Amino acid sequence: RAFVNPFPDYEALPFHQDGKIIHNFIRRIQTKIKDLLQQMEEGLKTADPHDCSAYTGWTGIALLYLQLYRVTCDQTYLLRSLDYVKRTLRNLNGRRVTFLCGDAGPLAVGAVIYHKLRSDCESQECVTKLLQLQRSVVCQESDLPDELLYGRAGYLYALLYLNTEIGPGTVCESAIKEVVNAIIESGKTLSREERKTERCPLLYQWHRKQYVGAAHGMAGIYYMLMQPAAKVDQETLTEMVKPSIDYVRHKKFRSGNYPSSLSNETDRLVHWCHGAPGVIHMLMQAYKVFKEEKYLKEAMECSDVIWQRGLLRKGYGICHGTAGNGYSFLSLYRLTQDKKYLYRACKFAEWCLDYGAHGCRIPDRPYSLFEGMAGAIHFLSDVLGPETSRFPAFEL
């Protein structure tokens, strides 16, 4: 599942003492980005015309070019992002709600792109249509899950995306509070039916499995609830979210990895979607909000599991691959300024410079943001500037 990580750890260099990446490594990274960009452009020509998702479709490619534009300021990239959103803005049936897999991705990415190209009316039309998803999400009688790829938390992300990328006052805080309350009541309900009201106040399941991790599980729901832009009150944070965070912490393996769901006792997946590379963001965010060192210390422990098991044979992607796990190191570095994690991110990036020379399997969507090439390009573009790195479709 993982390669043997060949690199020595930081103690046993691709940056200077002050944290700045050396010229040679920047140049090697920018060279590969150009290289991979052209392979991605070529392969997307045969990709599925209908998958418009941020996760595996066209909206994800526009997200990459938005990201390229954020970090280079090259207007060429802004314009190219428009080429990819435009594919996605016409078919919308409003049956999927999340930023990653539903209509909120095309719509929120489109609204941001239009706003940076100064056309306010198309920008506003996107936002207006996005908010029409509101009732389907807030309805407690809907079978809709709460998790990030198909549930309330993924819709919540789109709103926070608008208020952080465009600005506060794009989405009404009333509409964010409604979605937050819907998520909270959902977690109270299931936790009562499972008689966990006092041990895990907020409990969630997806397809009747109580997933632990970022993509479909509790760690990603708690992570969004802890976002400063979701404006959750102190009482709900300390009485409802923190004890739920602590409950999942105590389900961790002795190996330091985290299970895929509460029942599963076999330690296999070291992915953003399942395992320590996703749960670590819950812990790091828990450290930002609650400021107790045990949360950071556990994030550091997650980092060591990811350093040893995180170079994956699945591939180089964000969801379950080397780029997504490499982001764990950039995030922890931003939090700690401990250049050990800068080093570890730099080494995973080095692995990505050899993209496709390792005998990794080919993902179904091999050019996509979260399954394929676009995500690796995304991750490489952020190692250039570790201080401003953002995990796509997840950090704000």
Give the shortest CB-291-to-Zn ion separation in angstroms: 31
Give the residue with the Cβ less far from Zn ion, 110 or 375: 375
Which of 259, 226, 262 shows the shortest CA–CA distance to 242?
Answer: 226
Give the residue with the Cβ less far from Zn ion, 162 or 319: 319
Give the shortest CB-251-to-Zn ion separation in angstroms: 20
Give the shortest CB-317-to-Zn ion separation in angstroms: 8
Give the shortest CB-324-to-Zn ion separation in angstroms: 8
Give the residue with the Cβ less far from Zn ion, 68 or 302: 302
Give the residue with the Cβ less far from Zn ion, 154 or 386: 154
Q: Which residue number has the CB closest to Zn ion?
A: 273
Give the shortest CB-213-to-Zn ion separation in angstroms: 9
- Retrieve residue 322's tokens: 């080397």
276 Cβ contact partners less than 8 Å away, ≥ 6 residues apart = 256, 257, 258, 270, 302, 305, 306, 328
Give the shortest CB-365-to-Zn ion separation in angstroms: 11
- Would you give the distance in Å from CA 71 to the centre of its chain? 18
| Widest pairwise Cα distance in the chain | 58
Specify burial of residue 118 (Cβ count, 10 A radius: 0-12, 13-18, 19+): exposed
Give the shortest CB-371-to-Zn ion separation in angstroms: 8
Give the residue with the Cβ less far from Zn ion, 25 or 204: 204
Can you tell me the distance from the alpha carbon of 329 to that of 307, in angstroms, rounded to the nearest whole number? 9
Phi first, then psi: what are they for 312, rounded to 5°?
Answer: -105, 145
- Retrieve residue 80's tokens: 């190219």
Which of 103, 173, 88 shows the shortest CA–CA distance to 136?
Answer: 103
Give the residue with the Cβ less far from Zn ion, 115 or 274: 274
**Residues engaged in binding Zn ion (CB under 5 A):** 273, 319-320
Phi first, then psi: what are they for 246, rounded to 5°?
Answer: -65, -40
Give the residue with the Cβ less far from Zn ion, 273 or 332: 273
Q: Is 206 helix (H, G, I), strand (E, B) or coil?
A: strand
Crossing angle of the two packed helices 152-165 and 218-225, in degrees rounded to 10: 40
